[PDB]
Design a protein around this ligand. Structure first.
Ligand code: NI
Ligand code: NI
Lengths: 184, 189
């Protein structure tokens, strides 16, 4: 006789903290070489695609990643460790012509330097609990900044990949819907 | 001061962007991209998924290997040989053994690169002109399909599964990112 459960797998949709310094560094150290192998020597068509009107191009996403290496993660890590909660992070700020190959070189250099600084500043697991002040979010921990750093990379890789896939929305013909169905 | 109704409706009607050279550029890069991204990461990264009953990173790589044996090229051959007279088979009548997660992922990458390399040679043997792209066969449910539509679906398959791998890895830190969670869902800002 046929039966079911109410909200059968409710309990499964809850998650603890999985951050590990070593494991985070494994990802962070790979993103630049991954983007270079993937995108280098592709036709410019691929570098200029987006997910539609008023969304960033692939090239612009890589520039954005470079900008965060300069102005975002490491500067806020330093600020946490130096200012603690006594001051909120400062606001940020305050040429598409450059070959994408020059961008890859820059991102790889900045990332390499940033991972050396990371290692200098966070020298034990106990340091992951040190707190600073976000202008909107309130008290934030080092582990949360670094996690967001790893997730930020991944989020923009996926952004890049979906932009490229969108180029062929019409081209795939009747495969379009099924191409949205995963795990089958 | 006035506003428009459905201001950019007319911007949302996309044409066909497939070019053979550009398609092959991507397909030739996928194995080495997945290997440089995933090789030597902790097994934790390889076993992450997007939640209950979704595939692990490892399993997505195993599946891409299977697609290289079972899907794109065998269907291309069928289309070019049989045309629309006869639909190519659905996949639901030919089973495969579930494989061991115990095979080191390094071996899977080697296999995927080898099979992709072979498959791109075959593609160039079979599809030699623009006319060959306009050749039609018969999907057992969708009806008439063109070669360019199979090849385009192939490229998108790669990309869709790359995105699945990336999302599964990101998901691991859902709780870890703390108050950043909402904003990390907001793009182009
Ligand atoms: Ni961003
Ligand atoms: Ni698939």
């Amino acid at each position: 006789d046929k039966i079911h459960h109410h909200h059968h797998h409710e309990n499964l949709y809850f998650q603890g903290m999985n951050f590990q310094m070593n494991e985070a560094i494994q990802l962070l150290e790979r993103t630049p070489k991954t983007l270079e192998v993937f995108l280098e020597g592709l036709s410019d068509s691929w570098h200029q695609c987006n997910e539609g009107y008023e969304t960033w191009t692939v090239y612009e996403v890589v520039v954005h990643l470079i900008e965060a290496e300069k102005t975002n993660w490491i500067p806020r890590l330093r600020f946490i460790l130096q200012e603690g909660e006594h001051k909120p992070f400062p606001a940020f700020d305050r040429s598409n012509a450059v070959p994408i190959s020059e961008r890859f070189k820059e991102f790889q250099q900045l990332r390499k330097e940033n991972l050396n600084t990371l290692r200098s500043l966070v020298q034990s697991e106990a340091d992951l609990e040190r707190t600073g002040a976000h202008p909107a979010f309130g008290v934030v921990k080092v582990r949360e900044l670094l996690s967001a750093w790893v997730v930020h990379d991944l989020t923009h890789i996926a952004q890049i990949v979906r932009s490229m896939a969108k180029r062929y929305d019409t081209d795939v013909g009747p495969w379009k819907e099924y191409l949205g169905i995963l795990n089958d």
